[PDB]
Design a protein around this ligand. Structure first.
Ligand SMILES: C=C1/C(=C\C=C(/CC)c2cccc(CCC#CCC(O)(C(F)(F)F)C(F)(F)F)c2)C[C@@H](O)C[C@@H]1O
Ligand SMILES: C=C1/C(=C\C=C(/CC)c2cccc(CCC#CCC(O)(C(F)(F)F)C(F)(F)F)c2)C[C@@H](O)C[C@@H]1O
Lengths: 237, 9, 237, 9
């Protein structure tokens, strides 16, 4: 059985997701259009910038996050934003088409659509391999959300100052996930282990993106196309 | 840090 | 008569305008859409940001500007960008509708469309009065372009270091304008004087916009909607 | 100053 408190964490983490993810992708029309030089760069920056806004809404609703100091919240966020984005992006990734399908044919993002925004297959290849490996796991909603909140609360990120408290927080969430799979997932298996394997991949994808972002952000004709939010989060200050 | 603080309310 | 050199300045200043102003307003579709909270703020920031890019293209083509030092070019630009923008905006301002008409009905910018982007009638009132006062003058192309290049080369802006050279430049351009009106404008009249009157207005409109921009740029939920270029030009660094 | 310098070529 799960304790009353562990089901409250599950209740409130699932609801936080539903408030911050729109299965209709309707706000995509408010972005700058995509063009198919780095022609896809405006529209993706607007897209990621919007997602950062949603990750911050989700994070404000993880039990315990609201109570860390302001510096710790920012350091966690700056270091894990790109990985949470890769995680929530799994919900729109279709196994067929091998593309992110956000509704219409303009928001179908093949791998060629991403290269026209400054990235190379040295990142896109492991990214897509990550997206099918996650898709084949067939996670429940409650598992997907737990995975996100755990990746956020990792202590081993640059800039944290209260490891003991954020690690205590992360460990309470591992416990809830393990308990969920035991009681509520059939056969049990090593789902928990394949899930924790996926965390170690995001560390490697994080690093690649940050290298390629640095090259883009040094070229003033490309940083000009970013949003203020993107520059604040993926910058070093 | 300006935008993130305000966003973190 | 005008000397061979004064007609070269007129030739090359008119061509610079034609390269940097699109009477079709076709690139407006690449911006963020307008919405009618400050709902018009995305689309206008994208709009002004695009115009700053065109003012820099024009300025690089004024005889003598390319030869000032890099610091002087930037100081001139930072201080006069908003006024050149107000000047080139006259070309799309219709006397009827009392709005800027950039083609379709989405790019008709009444005065209400601008208030939904953070500005008040304490700026919009003298702005529209400026736009009809300029419209009624019925300037030739060669006069409109000269007016812009003169307003750019004023020495009395914060940050200039070589007044004597940029004033020598500005004075050669006043001479060309006076000569143009004598030879090429009918009756002569005090057109030159009403034109120089319009410069003194832009100084007053400049100040109002910069006050209201400062209030907007201090609110992080509104600076988040600006572009990097706008933040770099209207910031103080 | 970064973007303006590059834009000024
Ligand atoms: C993000 C989501 C969705 C899809 C994510 C996608 C596929 C298009 C995606 C594709 C490749 C990489 C990433 C990671 C973020 C980045 C970046 C850009 C950049 O590095 C740039 F521009 F420099 F290239 C940045 F961030 F700086 F802009 C996301 C759709 C939906 O499922 C909501 C979800 O939230
Ligand atoms: C600009 C042009 C055109 C129209 C100009 C217009 C009318 C819409 C306009 C209207 C009011 C004011 C201004 C001045 C620039 C500003 C600002 C915004 C802001 O202060 C903000 F957003 F905070 F409000 C800024 F700049 F920071 F974004 C221009 C159309 C065409 O004739 C090309 C020409 O180039």
């Amino acid at each position: 059985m799960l304790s009353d408190e562990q089901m409250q964490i599950i209740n409130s983490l699932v609801e936080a997701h539903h408030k911050t993810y729109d299965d209709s992708y309707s706000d995509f029309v408010r972005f700058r259009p995509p063009v198919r030089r780095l022609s896809m760069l405006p529209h993706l920056a607007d897209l990621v910038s919007y997602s950062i806004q949603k990750v911050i809404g989700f994070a404000k609703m993880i039990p315990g996050f609201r109570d860390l100091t302001a510096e710790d919240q920012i350091a966690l966020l700056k270091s894990s934003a790109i990985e949470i984005i890769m995680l929530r992006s799994n919900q729109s990734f279709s196994l067929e088409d091998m593309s992110w399908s956000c509704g219409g044919p303009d928001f179908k993002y093949c791998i060629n659509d991403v290269t026209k925004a400054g990235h190379t297959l040295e990142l896109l290849e492991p990214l897509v391999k990550f997206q099918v490996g996650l898709k084949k796991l067939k996670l429940h909603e409650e598992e997907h959300v737990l995975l996100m909140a755990i990746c956020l609360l990792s202590p081993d990120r640059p800039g944290v100052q209260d490891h003991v408290r954020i690690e205590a927080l992360q460990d309470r969430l591992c416990d809830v996930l393990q308990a969920y799979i035991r009681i509520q997932h059939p056969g049990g298996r090593l789902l928990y282990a394949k899930m924790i394997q996926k965390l170690a991949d995001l560390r490697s994808l994080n690093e690649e993106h940050s290298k390629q972002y640095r090259s883009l952000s040094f070229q003033p004709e490309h940083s000009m196309q970013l949003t203020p939010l993107v520059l604040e989060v993926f910058g070093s200050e | 840090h300006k935008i993130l603080h305000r966003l973190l309310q």
